[PDB]
Design a protein around this nucleic acid. Structure first.
Ligand SMILES: [Ca+2]
Ligand SMILES: [Ca+2]
Ligand SMILES: [Ca+2]
Ligand SMILES: [Ca+2]
Ligand SMILES: [Ca+2]
Ligand SMILES: [Ca+2]
Lengths: 338, 338
DNA sequence: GGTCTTCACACCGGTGTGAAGACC
DNA sequence: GGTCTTCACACCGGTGTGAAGACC
C-alpha cells in the first residue's frame, strides 16, 4: 500500500515483489544485482490510491513526496528481504522516479478527463473531492481523451488517413534525398474524443488505483484512437521532466518544434499547444529559456511569430494539477461547436 | 606526469594537487567531500605530453585509454593522501572526463593548425611525427585558427560589426514580441585567420604540453579574433560528447539548427559545417538519426535541402584525429583564393 | 511458429568553474 | 572598489521495458 504494510509485503508473490534479484541472471553488458520492478512498485504503492482523488492528506501532500514513495518503499522491501547485500544504483532510482512521475500525472489527468466527460454527457458533477464546477455549457461533443504514448511511438498514426497522406509524402520526399525527420515521442496528448466514441462508457468512469489491469488500460488507450483524430483536434501536448538541467531542457524544445512543423505547416492547424511539467527547476533559467520563439517560418516572415512551448508549470500538489487541467479544459472546450 | 610518478606527486604544492579536500569548506547545497581539480589534473597528466604529437605508443594508444588517465591518476593520488576516507562520485568523474576529452581534442587540433600554418607561411613541414604532407599549393592566406569557446559564449561577437548589426536587429525584432533565440555554445570553431594576424608567429608554434600557461593561451584565443571574422570564413564547427544517448544526441542538433538559421538565412553563407565527435556511440542509432535534414526553409521550399550535421566521427587514436583534420584542411582550403 | 533473448528508447541527479554579485 | 561568495552552464553513465529478433 501507500505506507508499506509488512503483512501486505509478506502476502505478495515472488514475481510481484518491488525488487527482482538478478544476481544469477545477469544482463548482457551490465553489472546490476537487484533491479527495481517499476510496474510492481506502481501496483504496490498506488494500487488503491490515485493522488488528487483520494484523501485530502494525500491530495494536499507535497507532490515531491508523493513521487518518491514507491522508491523508498522498494528500498525498505529490499532491506527486509536482503540484508547487508542489498544495494541499488542512484541512476536506476532516477530513471524509475521519472517514469513514476510521468505515469502518475497521466493517471491524475485521466481521472480529471473522466469527470469532465461525465459532466459533459449530463450525468452530474462528482463531489467527493471538492473541485469547482466548470461553467461551460454541457455538450456531448466537448469530450476529451487523455493518451499516454509509448516510448517509440510515431504519433502521426493517430491522424486520419487523408491528413497522414501528405505527411507521408513529405517524409518520402525527404527520404529520396537521403534525409530524415527524427524526433522523440511526446509524453502525453490530450485530444478531442472522436465521434464514434461519444457514447462509450469507458471514457466516463474513474479508476480506483494503478493496478496492473488499470496500467494496461491507460497504456493501451492510444490504440483505440489510432487513425481517428483530426489534425485540428489535438488540444494539448505535455512533456514531463522530474528535474531540469541547462542542457536537458533543449530536448522538449526540438520536440515542440518538429510537431509544429508537421501541424501548422503541412496541415494548416491553428496553433499547437505544448507545455512542460517539472518538480525542480532550480539551478537553471528555464523560465526565460522557454520564452523562445518556434523555429518555423522565421526564415520567410510569412506568418505570425509565437513560442514553441506554452508554459512551464511546477505543481505543488496533485490537487493543483487537477484544478489546472479543469481550468484549461473549461477555457479551451468553448472553441468546440456543440 | 602521464604515468603517475610518486616523487612528482610529493614535489607538488598543496594548491596544485589533483584532488582538493573541501570537507571543512562545504559547497552551499552540496555534500561533496573531495573535488577533482580539473585544471590541476590536466597540468599533471598532460603537462609535457600532447596526444598525436608525442611518442608513438601515446600516439597509437586506444584513445579511450588516453582520455581517462587523468581520472585514475587523481584516484591514485587521493588514495595516497587519504586512506579509507577518500571517495569520489561517479557523476563528477563523468563531468571531468567530458571536459578533459573536449580540451585534449582542442589542443590536438590546435597543434595540427599550427603545423598547417607553418607550412602555409613556407617554413617547411615538420616531420618528427610522420604525417602525409598536404598537396595544396602553399599560400599565406590559407591559414586557419582553432578557437575553443567558453561555456556561456554567444559566438556572434566574433563576427564583423556590419554582419553583427543585422543579427542584432533580428534579435531585437524578436525581443520586442517578448520572444527569444537561446542556444548552447558550440564547443570548437575552426575559422580562417584574419588579414591583420597573417604574420603573427603565435599561430605557427606548437605547445609542448597542457600547462596552465598553455591552458590559458588556448582558452583565451577567442578574444583575439573577436569582432574580426567574416560570416563566410567559419570553416568548421565541432561538438564533443564522450558518450552518446538516445536523448542527449538531440542537444547538438538544435545547436546545428540555430547556427545555420543565423548564417544561411540572415547572412547568405554558402553552408555551415557542423560535426559531432564521440568515443562510444553504442546503445543508440545515431548514425541514422544524424542523417537528418536541417530545420530551415522546409516550410517554404525556397532552397535546397541538406543535413544539419556533417558527420559523426569516432576517433580510435589521436593520430587518426590529426590525419582527419589535416585531410579536411587540405580539401577545404582550396576554396580560399590565395 | 512459438518462446527465449537481446537491443534501442528515454530516464535523470551529482558535478568544476568562470563570472555576476554583494557587503565591507 | 577590491576581494570573497554564490549561481547558472553543460557535463555524462547506470538504467526498466516494450519490441524486434533468432534458432529451435
Ligand atoms: Ca516518456
Ligand atoms: Ca509516455
Ligand atoms: Ca518524460
Ligand atoms: Ca563545452
Ligand atoms: Ca568549449
Ligand atoms: Ca562537449
Amino acid at each position: 500500500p501507500f505506507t508499506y504494510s509488512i503483512e501486505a509485503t509478506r502476502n505478495l508473490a515472488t514475481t510481484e515483489r518491488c525488487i527482482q534479484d538478478i544476481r544469477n541472471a545477469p544482463v548482457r553488458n551490465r553489472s546490476t544485482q537487484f533491479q527495481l520492478a517499476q510496474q510492481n512498485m506502481l501496483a504496490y504503492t498506488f494500487g488503491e490510491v490515485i493522488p488528487g482523488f483520494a484523501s485530502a492528506g494525500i491530495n494536499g501532500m507535497d507532490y515531491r513526496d508523493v513521487i518518491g514513495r514507491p522508491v523508498e518503499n522498494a528500498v525498505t522491501e529490499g532491506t527486509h528481504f536482503f540484508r547487508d547485500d542489498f544495494r541499488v544504483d542512484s541512476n536506476a532510482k532516477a530513471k524509475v522516479a521519472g517514469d513514476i512521475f510521468e505515469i502518475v500525472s497521466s493517471a491524475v489527468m485521466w481521472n480529471c478527463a473522466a469527470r469532465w466527460n461525465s459532466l459533459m454527457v449530463g450525468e452530474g458533477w462528482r463531489s467527493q473531492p471538492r473541485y469547482s464546477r466548470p461553467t461551460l455549457s454541457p455538450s456531448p461533443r466537448r469530450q476529451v481523451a487523455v493518451l499516454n504514448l509509448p516510448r517509440s511511438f510515431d504519433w502521426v498514426s493517430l491522424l486520419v488517413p487523408e491528413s497522414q497522406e501528405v505527411i507521408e509524402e513529405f517524409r518520402a520526399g525527404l527520404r529520396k534525398d537521403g534525409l530524415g525527420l527524427p524526433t522523440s515521442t511526446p509524453d502525453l496528448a490530450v485530444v478531442v474524443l472522436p465521434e464514434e466514441f461519444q457514447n462509450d462508457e469507458m471514457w466516463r468512469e474513474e479508476i480506483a488505483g494503478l493496478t496492473r489491469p488499470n496500467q494496461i488500460l491507460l497504456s493501451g488507450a492510444y490504440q483505440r484512437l489510432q487513425g481517428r483524430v483530426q489534425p485540428g483536434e489535438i488540444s494539448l501536448a505535455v512533456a514531463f521532466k522530474r528535474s531540469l538541467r541547462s542542457d536537458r531542457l533543449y530536448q522538449p524544445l526540438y520536440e515542440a518544434n518538429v510537431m509544429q512543423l508537421l501541424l501548422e505547416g503541412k496541415l494548416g492547424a491553428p496553433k499547437v499547444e505544448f507545455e512542460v511539467h517539472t518538480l525542480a527547476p532550480e539551478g537553471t533559467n528555464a523560465f526565460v529559456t522557454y520564452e523562445a520563439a518556434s523555429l518555423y517560418g522565421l526564415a520567410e516572415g510569412r506568418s505570425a511569430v509565437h513560442r514553441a512551448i506554452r508554459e512551464l508549470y511546477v505543481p505543488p500538489t496533485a490537487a493543483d494539477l487537477a484544478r489546472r487541467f479543469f481550468a484549461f479544459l473549461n477555457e479551451r472546450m468553448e472553441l468546440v461547436n456543440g
